[PDB]
Design a protein around this ligand. Structure first.
Ligand SMILES: Nc1nc(=O)c2nc(CNc3ccc(C(=O)N[C@@H](CCC(=O)O)C(=O)O)cc3)cnc2[nH]1
Ligand SMILES: [Ca+2]
Ligand SMILES: [Cl-]
Ligand SMILES: [Cl-]
Ligand SMILES: [Cl-]
Length: 159
């Protein structure tokens, strides 16, 4: 199955002109927990953001331009990206905006972190209809010594 994993500020903001103005190691740990030992598909901007390959995951970059790093797999279409994942139980789509938009219709599961930050968004998560999704997990957390904002983890399954 295909799943999307994303961190959403208020108004579904997922990306800004520059790095997001928060420090959420707990969210990064959640991201890692839920992507480890699964193939991850990302777009080129997200690849640049991360800086290097995500450890312990097959990294697949969806882009129309040729690849500039040999440590990851470069593909040019959605179907090629899926094919490159092979026969696995779950493929994780990790953004950004355009990649989420292309994979949402195929997705059966969303792993969302909702962050209590009001920011001006450059890119947004797709406008999904809550009516069509069932929350099967929710966990709320306050800001703390290591995390700059309150955040809530949710797992949705398509109804
Ligand atoms: N929940 C969630 N949070 C995110 O910040 C997030 N970010 C993107 C893409 N951006 C990023 C940026 C960095 C790392 C990252 O460095 N993750 C590490 C853990 C952090 C660390 O160990 O320092 C990893 O191994 O997964 C992942 C995704 C896509 N989906 C997300 N989903
Ligand atoms: Ca429920
Ligand atoms: Cl976790
Ligand atoms: Cl991207
Ligand atoms: Cl629900």
């Amino acid at each position: 199955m295909i799943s999307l994993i994303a961190a959403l500020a208020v108004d579904r903001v997922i990306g800004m002109e520059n790095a997001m103005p928060w420090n959420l190691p707990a969210d990064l740990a959640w991201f890692k927990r839920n992507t480890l030992d699964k193939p991850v598909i990302m777009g080129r901007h997200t690849w640049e953001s991360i800086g290097r390959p995500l450890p312990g995951r097959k990294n697949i970059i969806l882009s129309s331009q040729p690849g500039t790093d040999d440590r990851v797999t470069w593909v040019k279409s959605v179907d090629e990206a899926i094919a490159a994942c092979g026969d696995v139980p779950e493929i994780m789509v990790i953004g950004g905006g355009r990649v989420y938009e292309q994979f949402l219709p195929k997705a059966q599961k969303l792993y969302l972190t909702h962050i209590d930050a009001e920011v001006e968004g450059d890119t947004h998560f797709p406008d999904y209809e809550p009516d069509d999704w069932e929350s099967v997990f929710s966990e709320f957390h306050d800001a703390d010594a290591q995390n700059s904002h309150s955040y809530c983890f949710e797992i949705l399954e398509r109804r």
